[PDB]
């Protein structure tokens, strides 16, 4: 059966096959490494049966030796592509964070697309393996780190409705959120200001709800609205220094929270009507 099948490793290292996957009407085509597991089991069988005194043909031993001299690049490629597929499925689980890791996905896809041109017997196979494995491990740990911080950020945002109306606890919660965004900015993820602004509209809506609750609970008027209105905004690109521009009051504090009033401006009219 082995001398009928005629295994052997040749061609380029990657292989794009298309399978029909259940649950999806179209075919989903995936990426696999051009190294069949039958090659590895053939290597194991040749190393096993040779000691057993069973005479194996010369072409089989030749294929086994060529496989064993090409194995360490192949197993590393298999591990890299499996880790990449697992991490891409993990970021496809949470669609809210796809734009945050576009740069790393672009880098890894570029390293794959460069590596699709390499044949198995090429001289370039030694440093490309190390570079691909390093990049894929870095991408995977960056994704896991961002998953943890995004879960914590969602927890801290959802803790804002149950937070009591005072400037101290609000300032502490926004300080924690600003520190988490600072941690995002230190590791230089892609599309940070867009995601920060998308967070900031949600947090301004939540602060508008809390200001509504405080205003109807009021029904010294000026002092109660400075608890929310003097809260510092979330700054995305704060690590940069040197530009001698000053942000206005609208982009430093939540001074547009009155426009985010869910019942319209009538709650402010109802507040002023009692005076």
């Amino acid at each position: 059966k082995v001398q009928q099948r005629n295994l052997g490793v040749s061609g380029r290292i990657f292989t794009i096959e298309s399978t029909r996957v259940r649950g999806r009407t179209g075919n989903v085509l995936k990426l696999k490494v051009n190294f069949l597991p039958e090659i590895i089991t053939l290597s194991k069988e040749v190393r096993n049966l040779k000691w057993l005194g069973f005479r194996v043909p010369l072409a089989i031993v030749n294929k086994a030796h060529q496989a064993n001299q090409l194995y360490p690049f192949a197993i590393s490629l298999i591990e890299s592509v499996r880790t990449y597929e697992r991490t891409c499925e993990k970021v496809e689980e949470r669609n809210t964070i796809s734009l945050l890791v576009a740069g790393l996905k672009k880098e890894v896809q570029a390293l794959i697309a460069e590596g699709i041109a390499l044949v198995w017997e090429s001289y370039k196979l030694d440093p490309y393996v190390q570079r691909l494995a390093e990049t894929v491990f870095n991408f995977q740990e960056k994704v896991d780190d961002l998953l943890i911080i995004e879960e914590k950020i969602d927890l801290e945002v959802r803790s804002l409705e149950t937070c009591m109306y005072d400037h101290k606890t609000f300032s502490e919660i926004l300080n924690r959120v600003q520190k988490a965004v600072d941690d995002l900015n230190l590791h230089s993820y892609s599309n940070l200001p867009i995601w920060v602004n998308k967070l900031d509209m949600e947090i301004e809506r939540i602060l508008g709800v809390r200001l509504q609750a405080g205003l109807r609970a009021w029904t010294e008027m000026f002092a109660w609205k400075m608890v929310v209105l003097s809260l510092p905004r979330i700054q995305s690109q704060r690590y940069q220094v040197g530009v001698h521009y000053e942000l206005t009051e609208e982009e430093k504090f939540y001074r547009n929270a009155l426009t985010r009033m869910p019942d319209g401006p009538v709650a402010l009219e109802e507040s002023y009507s009692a005076v």
Binding site: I16, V28, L29, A102, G103
Partner: peptide, 21 residues
């Protein structure tokens, strides 16, 4: 910004590059 492509169309294009060379 930065917008990495969808993986499916990217690796269909890479499949075409595999076939053409």
């Amino acid at each position: 910004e930065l917008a990495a492509e969808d993986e499916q169309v990217f690796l269909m294009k890479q499949q075409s590059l595999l076939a053409k060379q």
